[PDB]
Amino acid sequence: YMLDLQPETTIQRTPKIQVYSRHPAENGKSNFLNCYVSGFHPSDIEVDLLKNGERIEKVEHSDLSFSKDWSFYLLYYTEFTPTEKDEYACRVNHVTLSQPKIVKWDRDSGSHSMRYFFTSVSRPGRGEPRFIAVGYVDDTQFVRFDSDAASQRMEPRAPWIEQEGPEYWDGETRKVKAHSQTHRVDLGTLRGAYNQSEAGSHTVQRMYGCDVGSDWRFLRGYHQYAYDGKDYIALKEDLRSWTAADMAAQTTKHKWEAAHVAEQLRAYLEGTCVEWLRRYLENGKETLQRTDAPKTHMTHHEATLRCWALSFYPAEITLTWQELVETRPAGDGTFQKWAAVVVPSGQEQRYTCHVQHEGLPKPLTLRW
């Protein structure tokens, strides 16, 4: 349930790549190949899945989203049955790369949240801007909009949300298009506020949502705005005043404090956001209220020790030694992760791997 009131109007990071399967690879058994690109900016990226030096035809990808630091992440995936002679990889091109990078498939009780992410990217002399919006409950996405898609409607992405009727879907579509109209204006406004020509591409990112505790009582609320991956204006933790990033944003901070915009947002974040998060948790409780404990395992002058965690939900986890690769989506709703540490051969028993996850009775300690 997005903001019902039309919103008030107004750095380059390279991607990290991971190529893996959904399930452990078994020759002759259907599986899924994944290429997870994360932590990059801007959003233009070319991703290919390769089979024996050839492009895989039917490849699908997830809807664009971004993290706290504003960097984007995506999951490219396709179905395949690995056999003996086949070799797979993923190729990624991005403005930060001299030439495309190839990565080969190396075969060998908690809080809750509702979040909405918005991304608008200008296309000089190529039509309207690209507008993408996705909704999340905890780590499960449940709605999406892509201005380039056919429907021009808010679309479901989880089973429980398909319950809702036409009144709900009509409203959400009316609201998302309003978010779109606002972003379209801001792009031109911010182009002027930064003295940029009408020839370059620019990005505006918006994120807002609310947190509740295990008692489903309001905990924290967010509302943030970013231009080209840099902070522009955000609502402070108390939801009563704004944080302006630079000199250009102070004009907007004063226009919004003059129009008391933070009061309407606080009411949404404290009330409506919470109320509909509660309804979602109940409607899809077979999904959103489950906890999948990680199936854990360990892999091994110097040698390498790697702790592995697979098929766990939610994504929040901690693997610590006594190299950490970003948590990645399995593609079926679960996640994976591993951590590594170097060790002189022989002294592999004086080290341990600790795993703090929300679904485990107590922490697990792993050693050779």
Add this chain to the structure above:
Amino acid sequence: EVKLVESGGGLVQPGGSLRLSCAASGSIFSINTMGWYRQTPGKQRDLVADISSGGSTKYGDSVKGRFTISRDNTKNTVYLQMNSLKPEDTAVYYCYGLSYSNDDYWGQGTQVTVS
């Protein structure tokens, strides 16, 4: 391991055409996909066209309809027929090839200029 010999670049008037060709050395069973990326004014190089040994093609949006890639059935040689060239097609065009183990090989490149 593999050597990629390029030729066919140079200068052309706006609206003109050029034929690039790239020939792969080594074993004929050591190369599958071959094509061309091109240098951008910035740091990255963008896809222009490539083709699998079976003839599957993919083009970059900015050359769709104007550029055509083809391959010799016998030898590992590809051809890029560039038509209706514009100044914004000025760049160094790098031939490339993929081993059947997904190893990439890159040529020196050929400067293409449109007045």
